[model samples]
Target: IVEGRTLNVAVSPASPPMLFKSADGKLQGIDLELFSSYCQSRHCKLNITEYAWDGMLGAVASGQADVAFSGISITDKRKKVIDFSEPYYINSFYLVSMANHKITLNNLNELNKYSIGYPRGMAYSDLIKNDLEPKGYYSLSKVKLYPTYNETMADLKNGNLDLAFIEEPVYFTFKNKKKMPIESRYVFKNVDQLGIAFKKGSPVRDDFNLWLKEQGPQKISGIVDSWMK
Candidate 1:
C-alpha cells in the first residue's frame, strides 16, 4: 500500500551500528540503509523525523509516524501496539560496570546490591520483570531510567550509577570508540530481536517483511556486518 508513497519514519539516533548519526551529523546505520533501500525499490520517499527513545515508539504506536526504527527490540508489550518486521538482528544486553568498580556478579542476588540504569524505552525492564525480578535478582523499581545510552554511560563513568544495561553494539561503541573503561559484569545473550516497527495493522509492515525476505540473509547480513566492527 505504500507504493510510490511517502513514508513517515520516526527515529531515535542513539544506537550506533543500528541507527545513529555519523560524524558529519547525517543519519547513518543499518536500519536507515535497509529502509532507504526498500524505499528506493518501492519508489517511495522517506520523511524522517527525530525524537527521543520513548517518543519514537510512541509516534509509531499512535500512528503519528508510519514506522519507527533504531535497533528497537520486539517485545510482547510492544507487539500489542505496533507491528514489527522480521528481526534483522539478534541482540544481547550487557550489564556493565566501571572497570575500577571491582565488582563481579556470579549470582542473581548480587544484582540487589547494585544500581542498574539504561535508556528508557529499551527492553531491559522486560527482562528484569519476566526473569530477573521473578527470581528476586533485582527490582524494576530500582532501575534508573535515562534519555539514552549516552546519558546512562555518562552516569556510570561519573559514578552516579553502579551499573548500566547496554546492548551489544553499544558496548562496543563505548569500548572501542569512546575508550570507556568498562567491563561486563554479565551478559544476557540473544535476549533481543531487533526490527523495524510499523503502526498497527499497516500494510507497509507486510510489504516490508516481503522485501526483507527477498533480500535474504546474506545480503542483509552484509549490510549489517559492514557497519559493525
Candidate 2:
C-alpha cells in the first residue's frame, strides 16, 4: 500500500483491450481496470502517467513510475531489464493487411514476397528474428519496423507495405478507431503472455504478483470480457 501514498503507474495507453484512451480522452481498458482494482483493494491512490510505447519499460526501470501497467509481454530479453508480475493474459499474433491485397497467405513461406511492418521493439520482431531469420528463407529486410502500429498501418494502407504483424486486440482497436477496411490475414500459433513490469528487485513486485494470483482467472476474464464487449 505504500502507506497511503499515491503510486505512479506508467502506461502506454495506445493499445486498446489492454490500455488506451476512450472517446472522452480518458484512459480505459483491462489493464487500467485491473490496476485500479488493485490500488483500491490496497487502499492506495493511483497516479497514471502515459508514455510512448518505447519509453514504458524505461519508465519502470528508471523509477519514473513505481510500476508499468502497460500490456507488456513476458519475454526473456525483457526479463533482463525489469521484473514482471505473473502473467495476466495471453495474446496471439495476427496479420493485418489491406483488404484488397490479393496474394493471400497460402503458406507461411509466402511471407517472403511481402513487405511486412511491425512496431519496433515488439515481440513480433523477435518472433520473426528467432523463427524466420535463422531459416534464411525470409529476407529480414522485408520486415519494416515502426515506432507504433498506427504508423505501420498507415504504410500498409498506402500500399507501402503488404502486411503488418500485430496482436489481434490491437488490430481490432486500429480497425475500430480508423474505420479502415483492413483484414486479418493469418493467426500465428505462437502466443505471448502479458504482464506488469517493475524495476528489478522492486519490493512491490512480489506484492503485485500475489495480488494477481488472488485475483484469479474468473476475475481477470471478467475484466477482459468487459472491454471486448
RMSD after Cα superposition, model 2 = 1.9
Q: Per-prediction TM-score, please?
A: 0.97, 0.91
What lDDT does candidate 1 reach at residue 148? 89
lDDT (tens digit, per residue) of candidate 2 on 39-112: 78777788877788778878887877788876788888888878988887778888888888866787677778
21 Cα displacement, candidate 1 (Å): 1.2
lDDT of 1 at 17: 80
Off by over 4 Å in 2: 176-179
- Relative to the true structure, candidate 2 reaches a TM of 0.91
Q: Mark the 10 consecutive residues where model 1 has the least summed lDDT.
A: 102-111
Highest lDDT against the true fold, candidate: 1
The lDDT for every candidate, in the order shown, is 0.92, 0.80
Model 1: per-residue lDDT, tens digit, 1-229? 6678998999999999899997899998999999999998888999999998989999999999999999999999999999999999899989999999988888787889899999887899899999988899989999999998889988999999999999998898899877889999998889789999999999999999999999999999899888887
